[PDB]
Design an enzyme around this catalytic site. Structure first.
Site, PDB file in Angstrom:
ATOM      1  N   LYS A   1      -1.204  24.845 -14.563  1.00 21.92           N
ATOM      2  CA  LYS A   1      -0.739  25.674 -13.482  1.00 21.92           C
ATOM      3  C   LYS A   1       0.666  25.905 -13.555  1.00 21.92           C
ATOM      4  CE  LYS A   1      -0.772  26.544  -8.007  1.00 21.92           C
ATOM      5  NZ  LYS A   1      -1.065  25.643  -7.304  1.00 21.92           N
TER       6      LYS A   1
ATOM      7  N   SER B   1      -1.531  21.847  -3.090  1.00 22.51           N
ATOM      8  CA  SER B   1      -0.353  21.929  -1.829  1.00 22.51           C
ATOM      9  C   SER B   1      -0.790  22.851  -0.609  1.00 22.51           C
ATOM     10  CB  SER B   1       0.840  22.613  -2.615  1.00 22.51           C
ATOM     11  OG  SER B   1       1.177  21.720  -3.843  1.00 22.51           O
ATOM     12  N   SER B   2      -1.567  23.862  -1.109  1.00 22.30           N
ATOM     13  CA  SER B   2      -1.778  24.782  -0.065  1.00 22.30           C
ATOM     14  C   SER B   2      -2.700  24.421   1.173  1.00 22.30           C
ATOM     15  CB  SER B   2      -2.275  26.046  -0.662  1.00 22.30           C
ATOM     16  OG  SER B   2      -1.171  26.759  -1.369  1.00 22.30           O
TER      17      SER B   2
ATOM     18  N   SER C   1      -1.685  30.519  -2.644  1.00 17.57           N
ATOM     19  CA  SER C   1      -2.012  30.795  -0.972  1.00 17.57           C
ATOM     20  C   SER C   1      -2.379  32.102  -0.714  1.00 17.57           C
ATOM     21  CB  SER C   1      -1.162  29.979  -0.456  1.00 17.57           C
ATOM     22  OG  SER C   1       0.123  30.654  -0.552  1.00 17.57           O
TER      23      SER C   1
ATOM     24  N   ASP D   1       2.877  33.596  -6.467  1.00 22.95           N
ATOM     25  CA  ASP D   1       2.429  34.867  -5.699  1.00 22.95           C
ATOM     26  C   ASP D   1       3.052  36.111  -5.865  1.00 22.95           C
ATOM     27  OD1 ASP D   1       0.889  32.668  -5.066  1.00 22.95           O
ATOM     28  OD2 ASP D   1       0.045  33.679  -3.256  1.00 22.95           O
ATOM     29  N   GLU D   2       4.529  36.089  -5.724  1.00 29.06           N
ATOM     30  CA  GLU D   2       5.349  36.971  -5.570  1.00 29.06           C
ATOM     31  C   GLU D   2       5.739  37.585  -6.834  1.00 29.06           C
ATOM     32  OE1 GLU D   2       5.906  33.763  -4.890  1.00 29.06           O
ATOM     33  OE2 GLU D   2       7.774  33.060  -5.492  1.00 29.06           O
TER      34      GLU D   2
ATOM     35  N   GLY E   1       1.399  30.451 -10.664  1.00 27.22           N
ATOM     36  CA  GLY E   1       1.332  29.973  -9.115  1.00 27.22           C
ATOM     37  C   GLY E   1       2.397  30.441  -8.497  1.00 27.22           C
TER      38      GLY E   1
ATOM     39  N   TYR F   1      -0.743  20.311 -13.646  1.00 26.20           N
ATOM     40  CA  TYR F   1      -0.127  21.290 -12.271  1.00 26.20           C
ATOM     41  C   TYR F   1       1.601  21.134 -12.582  1.00 26.20           C
ATOM     42  CZ  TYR F   1       0.863  22.931  -7.303  1.00 26.20           C
ATOM     43  OH  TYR F   1       1.100  23.654  -6.537  1.00 26.20           O
TER      44      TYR F   1
ATOM     45  N   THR G   1       4.758  27.081 -12.404  1.00 32.10           N
ATOM     46  CA  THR G   1       5.377  27.602 -11.141  1.00 32.10           C
ATOM     47  C   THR G   1       6.937  27.647 -11.309  1.00 32.10           C
ATOM     48  OG1 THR G   1       5.675  25.507 -10.257  1.00 32.10           O
ATOM     49  CG2 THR G   1       3.655  26.707  -9.628  1.00 32.10           C
TER      50      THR G   1
END
Lengths: 294, 298, 293, 291
Positions: free
Chosen positions: B170, B53-54, B213, B196-197, B194, B142, B172
């Site tokens: 992966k 995606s990124s 990303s 990041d935060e 997936g 994913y 999310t």
């Protein structure tokens, strides 16, 4: 107004494939023809969701665009869906459909990524600038998760080449507001199962996958409703909804294609990852075909 | 033939590879080479998630996606792990991309869950099986409900994870109950998170690594978060997460892909543009961005 | 002096007779089990978990009064008095304050689409009429109401809004709220994610399953704050077997069935909640033996 | 009585402490019948601010509304509540008063199983011996009722119909044809004309307290095939509904009634009063549509 040129009832053209997901050009021709001659529709919506368009490469889509047009007369109405996450492809496909004489383009709202409204707008504006054709916005929140407001339609419809919208949101308050706010824009509904409610909400026509097999009752619903025969129109909606609900339970595109194989059409296969019609539905579907003479 | 082809463990931290474009949406090859090297040399990451995606993958044509795979690969050493996202609504395309990435030596494939159409689970399952059967490579599901509309259940994970070539996931979905279940139910599969935060919460939940990303610009903090949390330095890990989420929040409010590429321009990288319909970074965010690069040493 | 509200709390469960009247004796028993058997810091009374939204005002007073009577003066007591009827909320806040409860808390007004400023002034008004400390009780899963970063600021700007029982499944928003309000009490309300909430810096938790699993939860919380993370997480695995099982059988009746196995008169749920289904009993007995409950 | 027709979802006027204003309430109730020419009242629905009331207030509202209007007027009592004992007590009280039917919202807040929802209805019916209308409202509750679940519910002879508010005309058409002998009342004022050509037996609405006349014309003309005129009146009604929603629906509808000399008082907190910044705009709507 000239923005109502493309009014009426369209088949969202289904596409037959071989084992390897290649277009079966011969069955495609037959399905086009079945939609005009047998189902009596005013036109075809080509390379929309119903045609498994988003599973195709660029050559395949050109192939569909080409055969669809070759397959019908000059007086048939033709709309080319060119929307794509790949704008270069969308422009390529737009020039191509335009040069072939398709009457209008249209494009699904960009999806997958959370595009800002300004990104969505200039996607449409860019296809227009580069093709110089008329454009129909294809608002489909059920598949894209993207909704467009009254204010956003004002901005979009201020472009003299955005001639209207294929409307899919299950919201008749919004339909009614749009209808009143844009009375000379073209509105085509894409919910086969609420054709009668759309008709009394003043839509200029409809685009549908089920009209490939049930185009005749659809035109009765649409005419009976505008003539104030609400009751008879509604009864046909019941009939049409038995068909739609049944066909959805079995998987809509392969199943519709199956009803066509019964008319002697070479309706081939869905493109994987769509699965072929499950035979465990054969009896139930035979009973449907006989009941409604499909 | 008889080549000792070494099976890398896929644990660790990956950059979801950003791609720079020109004014007509074509790939800037030198820009891309620099972006990949920044991920490895400056950001000190274990590998690259390529054509995700990124990387603006779903906006590209087949040739361009092939191009990206080739450049990313030719731009890194052999110690670097490579995952090829080949998922696509066109299954012929995905198999083709999957054979192509596999012939280039990518360590695994992954594929996003088929989306747009309301595909059945048996359809999603066989999509994966068909890619695997045609590529013979290891596959990572994913799972991205926020972009696809598709969630996957525990009973369905069992069915997928019973394929020996589906090596992992992966992950999310913002759901730490399901993550925990999955973690416990599949102790020998690979889980890469997936978000990041929420790296800190993911790490303590037993993930094997992560793809992001933002790792393109905050890769060193990410590592620190990952390592400290596992070493039991939980408070310091979380403080580093406060810092990271500052960056992530800011970059999300500006348009994440363009902004991250703009943070990279600033290091001399040829960061070009995003591909339309993405708009370029809006100059009105400039000062706020400069403040963030300065406070955080980006 | 006020108490330190930090810590672990049972969301108190309530036993009913065949007519949905409160069984006072069993109620005291459930309260005592939470403090004495499960070694918890406090009770959160008249929350979702005690079937409070099924109750009339007199019944809610009963529960307040019985809970308080059941426990020692060192025991932390938080009173959920939120209600669609603002007059009722005020009457229960005052009643609970005059009983000695350490804080009030109140669900987000729900059912109607209330504007944020409406939600704000429901809180400010309850506070003004009661003069007790208030804990925002945020549950998107039940109310469909979300609160933005900016909205917590407006609320938390008030000195008598002292914290939040957090239940949105969103660790990014938890982190934001944690960063921005280090002066505010954050208590988490998702048992199945206590480990994640703990490494995210919550000051404690309120839960219904701590009525039967309060010892493991204390360990999850202590071990994780001390950075012994592998072991905390393993106790979360164990805790989640329990939660998932309990969830699949009807969480409130099942929890009270477990308590019932300990000699507690845990009676029935209040209708239209249905009583524990016997077909679940073998699987339930298997849970009790495995984790010694 | 036949339960067919058009109903006002009765609004309630309050003083500053959120106590019922009984005279204003008599007036709002009589306005629905005499001025708005409606067939009936739907009492203690959501529009009445019912869920902010205590038990005794609910009873006060049922009593005032009934004593306010003639015997020939149709009356439905909404008694649903999360407290089943309170629902049963209110259903008994409303039945003893002579309300033609009861209804109850779907139980909400908690994740009740369908079985729990079913027996909540069945228990209410059992203890009241009155007819029951299921008030199904996914927009406010998060509960949808599937077609197979409807059938289990409508198999009961005392579940006489449904106040339907789900914005889904596929599902309505299925229910309409699966239950041709049940009563279906639509509760979305802004899609009255779509509901009418979909076979609803009538409708329940908060905006009908001020625009009941137009609504009657929408119902009547659409059933007459006078489709264009019906839809036009829906445009007009939708200007009114949209404006009213943008200003706070309950307080604003009560403001329209106050302009008529009715003691419409205030909303119950935590609903806020009508914001005067809307006054000019509201004045213009009232001038334009003669409200």
């Amino acid at each position: 107004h000239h923005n109502k040129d493309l009014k009426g009832l369209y088949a969202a053209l289904l596409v037959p494939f071989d084992e390897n997901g290649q277009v079966n050009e011969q069955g495609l021709k037959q399905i086009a023809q079945n939609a005009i001659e047998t189902e009596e529709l005013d036109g075809l919506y080509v390379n929309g969701s119903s045609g498994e368009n988003f599973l195709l490469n660029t050559e395949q889509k050109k192939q569909v665009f080409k055969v669809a047009k070759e397959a019908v007369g000059d007086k048939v109405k033709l709309i080319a869906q060119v929307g794509s996450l790949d704008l270069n492809e969308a422009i390529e496909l737009g020039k191509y459909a335009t040069e072939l004489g398709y009457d209008a383009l249209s494009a699904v709202t960009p999806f997958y990524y959370p595009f800002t409204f300004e990104e969505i707008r200039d996607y449409y504006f860019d296809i227009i600038e580069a093709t110089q054709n008329n454009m129909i916005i294809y608002a489909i929140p059920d598949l894209t998760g993207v909704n467009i407001s009254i204010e956003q339609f004002s901005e979009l419809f201020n472009h003299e080449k955005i001639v209207g919208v294929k409307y899919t949101a299950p919201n008749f308050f919004l339909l009614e507001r749009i209808r009143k706010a844009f009375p000379d824009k073209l509105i085509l509904s894409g919910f086969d199962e609420m054709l009668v409610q759309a008709t009394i909400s003043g839509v200029d026509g409809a685009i549908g996958s089920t009209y490939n097999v049930n185009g005749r009752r659809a035109r009765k619903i649409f005419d009976l409703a505008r003539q104030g025969q609400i009751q008879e129109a509604y009864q046909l909606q019941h009939d049409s909804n038995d068909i739609i609900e049944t066909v959805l339970s079995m998987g809509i595109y392969p199943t519709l294609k199956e009803i066509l194989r019964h008319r002697g059409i070479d309706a081939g296969l869905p493109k994987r990852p769509f699965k072929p019609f499950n035979e465990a539905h054969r009896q139930t579907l035979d009973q449907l075909i006989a009941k409604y003479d499909l």
